[PDB]
From a paper:
The 14-3-3 family of eukaryotic proteins are abundant, medium sized proteins (~30 kDa subunit mass) endowed with a well-characterized phosphopeptide-binding ability.
Although the distance between the C-terminal tryptophan of the 14-3-3 core and the positively charged residues typically coordinating the phosphoserine, was too short to allow canonical phosphopeptide binding, binding of a phosphorylated residue was still observed. Surprisingly, in both cross-patching peptides, we found that it was the second Ser residue of the linker (-GSGpS-) that was phosphorylated and bound in the adjacent subunits’ AG. In one of the chains, we could trace three residues beyond this pSer, LRR, indicating that the bound peptide had a completely reversed orientation to those observed for pCH1, pCH2 and other known 14-3-3/phosphopeptide structures. This clearly exemplified the extremely rare case when a peptide phosphorylated by PKA at a non-canonical position (N-..pSXXR..-C instead of N-..RXXpS..-C) was then erroneously accommodated in the AG of 14-3-3 but in the non-standard, opposite orientation. Surprisingly, in the pCH3 structure, the open conformation of the 14-3-3σ subunit did not prevent binding of either the sulfate ion or a phosphorylated peptide (yellow).
Author numbering:
A (entry chain A): 1 to 74, 78 to 235
B (entry chain C): 2 to 72, 76 to 231
The structure:
Amino acid sequence: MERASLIQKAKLAEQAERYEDMAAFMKGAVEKGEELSCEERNLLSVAYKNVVGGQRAAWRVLSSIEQKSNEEGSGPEVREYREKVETELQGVCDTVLGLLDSHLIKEAGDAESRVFYLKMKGDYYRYLAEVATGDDKKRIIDSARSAYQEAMDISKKEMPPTNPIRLGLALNFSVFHYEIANSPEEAISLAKTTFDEAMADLHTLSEDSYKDSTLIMQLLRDNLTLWTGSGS
Amino acid sequence: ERASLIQKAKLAEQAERYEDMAAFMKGAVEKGEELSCEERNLLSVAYKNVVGGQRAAWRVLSSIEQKSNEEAAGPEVREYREKVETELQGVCDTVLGLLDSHLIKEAGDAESRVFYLKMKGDYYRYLAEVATGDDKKRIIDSARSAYQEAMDISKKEMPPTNPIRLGLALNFSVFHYEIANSPEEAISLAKTTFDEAMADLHTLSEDSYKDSTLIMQLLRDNLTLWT
């Protein structure tokens, strides 16, 4: 089907490293109104993650230049171009959130995929929050907070504390608390709690999941080590 | 203004947004001012990166299209390889379009005129790596007549150790071996360019010593690979 061609082409774009095209093919495939398989969700995620990743990296470089020029010692061209990048980035996030709302979230049946999409919804509102400045910041921060909270409530009632999707979601929500909401204590606390609960349930894991789950637990410990300790 | 476009192209280079860098350089060229040394290099980088990425992707796809013949396959591969091919053609046409009105006709000195006439030969050569039909011959010839006019405002204007003149000869020899499939002419041109620059090494200054020997390295590499 039209859908089978779009999926095949998205795989070719991944191999050709044409992520903008990969995103477009996955968008079109979603729009066929079929549920995404596990492999397909990951193709969708990779496409948009790469696209937004590049825009965020560039925005940081430009924002950094804009700030080092307003400092003691050292034209409006920097602001104009930083705004262009910002606007482009917003377009991508709005597109992603538009797809999750109409129609990935409301269209998913089982709990695993419902959590995956809500986590993605928090992730993309969090990306919008990284750049937002006005009265709009607060609303956006809150829409990311509810997407993550709704995903957390489902994962607690439907998944074991060692499930990698659950661990991934908690890890991102804690990063959101530290960096976005600027609630470092809540971030540290959520991270430790998630770790210790998964830790108590390690013995119940099968061989293949233990690798995936300990890898995410490594990321939680890394953040905890960073958030609780200096240098010098 | 032109000053803003130039400044923005520099920012895009730092943000690695080459598509945007190309667009800013195009706009700045269109002001009708001559490009300084720094500016020509921003223009060459901006389009080289863009086209480089498209060529690399086309090769990957063309390779997959050939490995599927024997024998999911489907027409999807061809459909997408054609999309990439078409996109690439648009870029080359844009480059050559301003390398015509105006860049080589707008330049006064010989170094600058050679730079643009090398670039024109380079972008026609790119159009060939994709073209196959009755069109493959015309394009090869437009790259050829561009490289020969460039090969003559070089031997008669620049020393045999000049890096621009070495760079141009290196590319024209690659055009003979790979595109025109005249391996003998390629080998001959390469060896000649090498040995003439070799005789004049002692006359080089400290800073040019590095740049010129580097090009001569790519010419002793090619000649120990091709033969």
